[PDB]
Symmetry: D2
Subunit: 198 residues, 4 copies
Amino acid sequence: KHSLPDLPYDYGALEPHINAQIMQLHHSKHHAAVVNNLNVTEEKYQEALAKGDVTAQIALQPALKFNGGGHINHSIFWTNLSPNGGGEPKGELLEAIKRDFGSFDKFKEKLTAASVGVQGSGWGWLGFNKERGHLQIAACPNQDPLQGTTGLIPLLGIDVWEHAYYLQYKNVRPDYLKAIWNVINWENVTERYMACKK
Amino acid sequence: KHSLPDLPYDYGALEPHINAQIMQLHHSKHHAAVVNNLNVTEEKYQEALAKGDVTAQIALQPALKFNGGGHINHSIFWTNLSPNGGGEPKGELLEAIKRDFGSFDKFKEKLTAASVGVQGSGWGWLGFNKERGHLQIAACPNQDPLQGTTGLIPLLGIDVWEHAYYLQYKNVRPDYLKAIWNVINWENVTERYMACKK
Amino acid sequence: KHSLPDLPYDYGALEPHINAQIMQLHHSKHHAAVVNNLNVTEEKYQEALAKGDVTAQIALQPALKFNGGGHINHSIFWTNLSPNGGGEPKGELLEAIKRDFGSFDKFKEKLTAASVGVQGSGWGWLGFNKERGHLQIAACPNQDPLQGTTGLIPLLGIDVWEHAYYLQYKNVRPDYLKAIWNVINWENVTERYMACKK
Amino acid sequence: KHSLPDLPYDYGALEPHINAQIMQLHHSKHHAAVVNNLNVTEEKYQEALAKGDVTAQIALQPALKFNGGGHINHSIFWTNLSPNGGGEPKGELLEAIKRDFGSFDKFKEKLTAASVGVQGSGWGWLGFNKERGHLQIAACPNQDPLQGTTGLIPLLGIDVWEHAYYLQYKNVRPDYLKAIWNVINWENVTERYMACKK
Ligand SMILES: [Mn+2]
Ligand SMILES: [Mn+2]
Ligand SMILES: [Mn+2]
Ligand SMILES: [Mn+2]
């Protein structure tokens, strides 16, 4: 039974980069909805499966991908942010960043590019390619989860749906991106990165 | 040279159904951006074409579909609304509505369904099937235009991107839908509908 | 636990419209393969679902739709064909055809057009729109099944994947489409049709 | 105005890895067809663009990408093959292979895997990531070209559409992939490779 994870901080802990109103609606409304819908969809799939109803299984994929993906994306996104966030990582993550992207600064510009590049709803990601053994940036549409659809392990995700910023930054997505860098929780991103090492 | 069409009314003419802030940002920012980008993209395509650069032509499709589609969608959307809007059409359109959807009320619920059904950004449409000679509802993702991607002629479009309602209705899209019915300009929809008759 | 259905006739029963080599390969190799792959995929989804592993469920979707859809489509396909087949349908189904598409030949041209129109691999279909309560033609990419992806009820399907005709017709898909009309099993198409109204 | 390029060798030059019947059909029928359809599509887009008809431009995109891509892919394909071909590449390209994929055999398994993995019609590719400055493998659906859709530079392409192997290998795509390694023209792949660094 999937459940809505508690935010690691208060709804206003990211001010002024991401105001409390956005944070509150994001946890309590958008993420809450998809968890419940994910559960409803899963139950349905369990029944369709048991009866060998392939057609039902297919018709249910969009809702499962969207609600399941949404739950995955927000669970990770919350952890990716912090009131102590900002700055740059150190050690291996930072070393990998320069290695695969030239410099941390170039990296920000690239991930910022993929994120602003999303036409419509979506997410920009810094993920790890286990097969290639290196970092990689990818953009995913709507709620399609990174690992489930590309195989890359999610490290840093920048939610770019308009409910992630419109109330505060309106149609100017670049300002949202520039701002979010101030709250990135690199300790978590580093943790995730190291979990790929082992 | 494509240009930003003037709204048929003032930015606050749709209050309280669609507030002036949304209207202003929608005309002046979202629609304005895509017209300019559409022009830039077209120029590029003219050059790619002239040189027989097929790869360039392909790489340019997303921007052309999105910006071109966006311009088409908003040009129509503005005309689809009015301060006198609301109610129901009469004559042939209304007759076709009952004919193809049972009743006007059933129709609203169906178009409302496709519109709320959009997972991510998109549009809900009431269009005309020239080949079948009847009305039809369709949902299109992001800025993909109705006629250009389905062949159906656009009659009524309900923009469902979050910039069409988030500031006022937040994450509750149904309230936005329920509200928009009050400003639908049926005279225009009827006009468009009749242009399919001839 | 899904199984490969025996054909309703001899492998060379559809000669000379579809030769025995094709029929045999198509049944014993192509359909058999998706049957097995489906059973494998479903088993995996069963474990994923039981573990609450949403990522895995998402990753399995392409295979489930492809193999699951492959199984649905080919099963229907075999029943839509007959060595005694051909000609035209009669009664209600035939009435619907005249009404929905004008005439049998107009319907034929439309189904043929949709089938020849498939770019890459796919299927052309004659379906039933329960909502609108009428006939509707559609094309599906790869093995995406009609109902699971469009909500339409499959009545008649035409496989336009190259393995469905290449050995006998090579690149000339049109020659294949013309020939297949001779072995259509309207008795079966009719059954599926009458089962829609109930 | 696009034209069909003569093959660099005799239709039966790749025997017995790819037989003469396939080569001839593939060149004179399949590639020829996309060449013509491309010229037709481009001419239409030329008129659409000149008239500012965005809807028409949008409608033409699927055909432009399919035919345009078809032309790009097959042109590259012919040069990637040689009757004297086979073996392994040497020097930088070979060095990159060992580095990017471990070894030649690891690279082979990966390209083969991507090619066999294509569900429906498509191509497996060995490309060059100019941004990351390294080799990268990818698969493209139908005729979607490598660069125009992924930004990667095509070095080696493997057509896994059924018309590329069915007459000779039937459903056994793996047998096709193994055989094709014998006629790869590394001299050409190398040229494309060295042209990337410049
Ligand atoms: Mn979100
Ligand atoms: Mn809009
Ligand atoms: Mn088949
Ligand atoms: Mn080919």
